[PDB]
Write a protein that binds this ligand. Sequence first.
Ligand SMILES: [Zn+2]
Lengths: 1364, 217, 63, 26, 32
Amino acid sequence: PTQYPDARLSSPIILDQCDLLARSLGLYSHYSHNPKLRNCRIPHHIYRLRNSTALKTFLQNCSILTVPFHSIWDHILTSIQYDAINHVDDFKYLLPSELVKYANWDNEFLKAYLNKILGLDHVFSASARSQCEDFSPKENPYYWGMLLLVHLSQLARRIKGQRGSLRSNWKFIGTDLELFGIADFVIFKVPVKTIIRNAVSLQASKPGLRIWYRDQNLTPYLCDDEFIVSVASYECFIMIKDVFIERYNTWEICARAWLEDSDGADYPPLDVLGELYNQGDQIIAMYLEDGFKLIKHLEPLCVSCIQTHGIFTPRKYWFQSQMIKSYYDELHDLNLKLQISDNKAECAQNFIKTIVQAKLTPQQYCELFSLQKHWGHPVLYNDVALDKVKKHAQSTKILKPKVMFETFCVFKFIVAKNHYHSQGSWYKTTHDLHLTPYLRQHIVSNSFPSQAEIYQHLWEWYFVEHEPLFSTKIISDLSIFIKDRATAVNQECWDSVFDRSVLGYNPPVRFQSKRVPEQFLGQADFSLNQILEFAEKLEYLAPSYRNFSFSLKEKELNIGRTFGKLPYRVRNVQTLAEALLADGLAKAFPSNMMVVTEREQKEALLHQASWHHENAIVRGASFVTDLEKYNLAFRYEFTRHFIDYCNRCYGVKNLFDWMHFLIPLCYMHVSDFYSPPHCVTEDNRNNPPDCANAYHYHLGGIEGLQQKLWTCISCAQITLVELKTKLKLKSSVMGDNQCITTLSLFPIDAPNDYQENEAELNAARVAVELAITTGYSGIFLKPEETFVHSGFIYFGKKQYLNGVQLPQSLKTMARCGPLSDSIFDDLQGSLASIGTSFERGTSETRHIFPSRWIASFHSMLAINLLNQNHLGFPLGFNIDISCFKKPLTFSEKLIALITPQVLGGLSFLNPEKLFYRNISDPLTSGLFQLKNALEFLEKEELFYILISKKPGLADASDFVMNPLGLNVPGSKEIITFLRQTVRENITITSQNRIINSLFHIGSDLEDQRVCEWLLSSNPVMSRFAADIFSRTPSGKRLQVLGYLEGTRTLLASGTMLMKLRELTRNRWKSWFSYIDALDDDLSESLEKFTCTVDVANFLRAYSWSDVLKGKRLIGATLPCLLEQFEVKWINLSEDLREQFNLSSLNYVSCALDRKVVQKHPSVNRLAWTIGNRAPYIGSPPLRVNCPSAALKEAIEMVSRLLWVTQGTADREKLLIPLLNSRVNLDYQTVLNFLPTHYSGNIVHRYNDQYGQHSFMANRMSNTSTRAIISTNTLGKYAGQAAIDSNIIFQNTINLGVAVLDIALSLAKLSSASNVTFRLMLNKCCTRHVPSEYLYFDKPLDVDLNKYMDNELVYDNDPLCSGIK
Amino acid sequence: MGRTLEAISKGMSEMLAKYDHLVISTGRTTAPAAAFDAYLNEHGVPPPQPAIFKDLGVAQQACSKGTMVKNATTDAADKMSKVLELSEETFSKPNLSAKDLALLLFTHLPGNNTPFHILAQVLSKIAYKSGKSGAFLDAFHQILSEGENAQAALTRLSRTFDAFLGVVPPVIRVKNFQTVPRPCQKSLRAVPPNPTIDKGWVCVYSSEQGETRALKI
Amino acid sequence: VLKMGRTLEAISKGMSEMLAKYDHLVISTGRTTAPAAAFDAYLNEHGVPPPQPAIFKDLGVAQ
Amino acid sequence: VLKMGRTLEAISKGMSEMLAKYDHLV
Amino acid sequence: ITPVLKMGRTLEAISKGMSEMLAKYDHLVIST
Ligand SMILES: [Zn+2]
């Protein structure tokens, strides 16, 4: 009940068991390469499906032969696309016309909202073609198919969820393409005539079928039967559904954008989409799995086309030339493996020509880069997957000792240099000084040698020895063990992961448990020193722990990438080693030191690019290498010394050697349930031989086992190259790619072409040197896939061309859907997922309304779909009829979708989030939005009815956990109803000593007492209470609950189903009825106020009256920015007045910078250019070397509580009970670490001192570089009455930048256009908040000193590292 | 003798450090010269143990005395040798054969079986024979960057590029004039006295019966 | 002193020869390095061969 | 000149150790 | 004062070790 089949595809596509189904139905199939599946006996739970009468009538009048899945893929897509409109009666519900109606209304609402906010009427006009009801049904080719597959996918999820009843099935009958769904399988059925299509034979029409039927007369099996069948799994169907939704979203967004602008829209035109979609479908159908080899080239080709846009230099076309040659090389291979004539394979050439010959701008190419997964994913074979890994991980390497020696010495030098610049002195050396003469007289004088002389005396660093650093018994997080992970089984029972019938024998022993969360709770002792002892004694080398197994990744287009799974205790060792490395020593290596150089200040560039220490010009150039191919190339001969040095640095021994000591002793295989090793038998089982699946003596690394150490070594070699070539380099590591930039200096009088050529020459020198340096380490850079360019860069997860950020909106907005992965198909889970995806999508583009339409469409679709097809209920249930006894109307759903979530509604698309993500106060902005929406809807009298609902029954702990919310039942999340069950199971199934000590018998009483105490001050401050609660052991307890929630048979563990059903009905009643929830007194009382701050204050006071007990609440309400400031336009150029259709004190002033630095392709749009500005840059006596998390949190609690209370008080007796629960220090010693205090205004200065803010506007970052914001003109607020006001001056900058960006998003600019306006302050919302202290009249009376045993909670020796 | 002693001291320290690193890296299982040679001669493949070679070329020449057959060690050394050949003027420079170059030019052209496809084949073959393929490709890319299409680029290259001055068009054997592609039929003409490429004559079609047609673009 | 002069002239020659040769050295990897290290580490820690040492015999390391 | 003698003795010590290590190989 | 007698002694030992290294290099390194 708690868990259901995944809503979206997240798993690899494996089709082994299909061969067993076909043999049990009397058909023929050859999906698998495993010879075990040709003659084994069928597992019973599959063999039993042949008895169903529905499946026998579905297979009536069919042939004995079947075909693979992809050869049909093309026809499947076309058939659903053209036939889905004749089956509307099947999905008569979902009310499509209402979906379109709601989306149109929402765009009109947002247009009115923005017209009022920006102060200009008629900024957004009416293209009556997009606004008609018939636009999307008539002009989008994927509309009806998308609706039909949403319906069918819900049915398929229901059928798979049931554990197999032999009568649960679904089917769909069309003009073509019948479907049938049974327990785990889906069967596709097509007429024979549509595949032959007037050809000589079946193989002649589809050459890819020669792999299954080499050259056989197939006509005896096809004359008497009208249909032919293909068997596949449930994942294939989910992938088809995903493909339709993605294509519909993409087409709709592009079409609306091209109607919006029609000169330049940052989206590929519809011609290109139609062509690419059709040709990709044909390529996949003709070449089956291989086709993905050709289709995999879409992304590099798009990148190589983007690169050809700057000042011409021949090198700019080399990458494109290389990609074209690779594409045809691939094609030539495929054409000889299948003996395809040249005239047959026109689709592949059309695919490449369509990409290249479309002359798009860089923005449209960057958007087209995002269609990589719009054709599906391939079928994986574990033998093909492991052939590559075996060849690469067993190969022999030729290494040069000199390169290895020098990079090791550089490693040691980097560590020593970071230590010196951090702590101002040499660490304590223990080696004889005579061995190193050059370093001796720098050590004696406590000076560090310069960068210029390090290379000459590089060898001397081999002899340096010193005292240990980075004590081991403390790690910062300690919550990484709790996280979910997949593990392997012990070596006694390694067969147990396979099927008994396929194996051919019954394994003697069966495994007890596998997942991490279920085995962390089972381990009885779990010390951290005991893991250290386990590693020190090399206990793992025992015969029980010598098992390792692979598994394949979900959604990629290659032949298969593997991630590894270890036994449980070796996994603990790996996690501890990587955490230790990431906290202590990985800090000396900057792997993200980059910023985009075109966006960096000239003085900083000059300072960084000077070799030693102005009339100089700095020009950069970058190249990109792939880090994925590093893992398998590492050998022990190379890494011995680095591992040993890490061991010495931590004082431990043999800890970091675990991978190289253990991996070569394991038996490498894939843990596929239906594909055991080809050759394993019963007597062969103890020492099995090598076969296609499995092998011995893996010699390299694995994808994620030692990522920190490998990245550190890579940084050391890059630094060695820097010493050799005497050029400044800056490297950045993304998830997979690492980009390196070389900086070069030129005189002032140099032609631009000369600089462009010389920068690339220097970058090429560096690239060649790095290629040699890594080649002598066994790691081969492949120069064929590497390019050197002057403008193209990856920096965040984004792409830049000459400093101009390019849009990537489709990547996140094409995955928008009605459902997400939540608990029991929760409606808020789905809507919240949509809302977050929307805010990111807007952050990555300049077109607003095309994405907004999609978000509103899918919101209404989610409501209807879950209304009548919920999985947690019987098949036809109609929640609304059960709940209100009558069907819901359009207006009720609309009003539910308008009410903000803080008030108990279902609105997760706040328009204010177009400006910035972090909103100071959600209640006031929600009230502002609701008032505007009701004024637009003309139902202005419903405001006080909708906001005034009956308060619920909530304790103090609920209010402490949700500081800024209301006491409404409808706004509460669903996890809060399961938490109590999870806790109960934890107190039943746990033997871990740490967990049993943390969740002791009387923890509930502690939670009740602490939450009641934190709200007992005379003026209550909820933010302070929440901040404090996060750092007590109760906060840790909540964190552990949050980690442990995402599990099975712990959250899950009849009556649980009934409980969930009743909760769902109650929530729907609360959401969709507003006359039921009313307080006539509250409405009568609210009716007098006019400012939104007064309304918010009254609501907060009234809602939590029982908790507050007459005291008054402070520190929660802040004004909405869009109501406090109004936009007044001062000067507009003459060319913009025609476009906006207009005819003619304290403030912030904003203007547009006239000077342009870069532009691509022209200056006609504001988002195509960058400038000079940078408005965001404007906005402790003791310190311990290694402070644990407990000490950090204790310091934060002491700081906050000291800052809140008054000086003339008795603070110490209040501080002891809290501090004794975390650390062992006395009161007085702690004060020695507090920073400077004694300045601030408590109510105002709490939000800005300790709050969490947004550092930038939620737009693309090109606009900020041309905005001139000046906050000096707002009078007495520029600390007189400024520290004592509501205004937050960091958010007005974001508002100014966002206004400038949003207003000019579609205007056509020129070289003579300029814009300046001002934000005017209003008097209604501004308040003068006097400085006020909190008075606690009674200290906490509860013994919180009970966790002296937990190292997760307590620090027994808080200060063992250096005092510094 | 202070200088002649201090120099020896520093170098001895350096030599010590380097060789200590070497012995630690491969220690305790490395194959000596005699055992390596004996195993290689008697089995035909080198032992599964690490070994130390004088030069990269020595590793490239390690093969059984009786017969020269490639073994994993030789392949690893040859791979490394191709890496050493790299130079920084030609890093990632495309190396294209005549057929590959023709395929690229085809990728840049619109339509199918137009006269420009035949022109592309002829030009690619001629450029590759004279060893001037890289300059030809760079000139083509430059004309593309100026803002024109591939057809105008090809015509201008036919006029101006140095490798095509005073070159007679090649001769193509066909069964008849119905064998020539349909889009190119309308452009056929009569053979001029002295045809040449820089004047717009692509190739000469000679039928089975001695009839010759010259393609003009 | 003369013996010191002759010894120094021999030592400098040997040293220059070793450095010049080291500049050109190259090595190849094998599959017996990490198992041999693990075997020696286990004997160092406990004094006895690791359990089920037959695999080390297969690699030719346990000796 | 004492510093020279100390450096030489240290070098001899390290040399002895590394000769032992090489003796292990052959 | 002992360093003087000890270099005079230790240069002979250094020469012997150096000779040993020239000997070992001829057996370890493949040079055919
Ligand atoms: Zn107001």
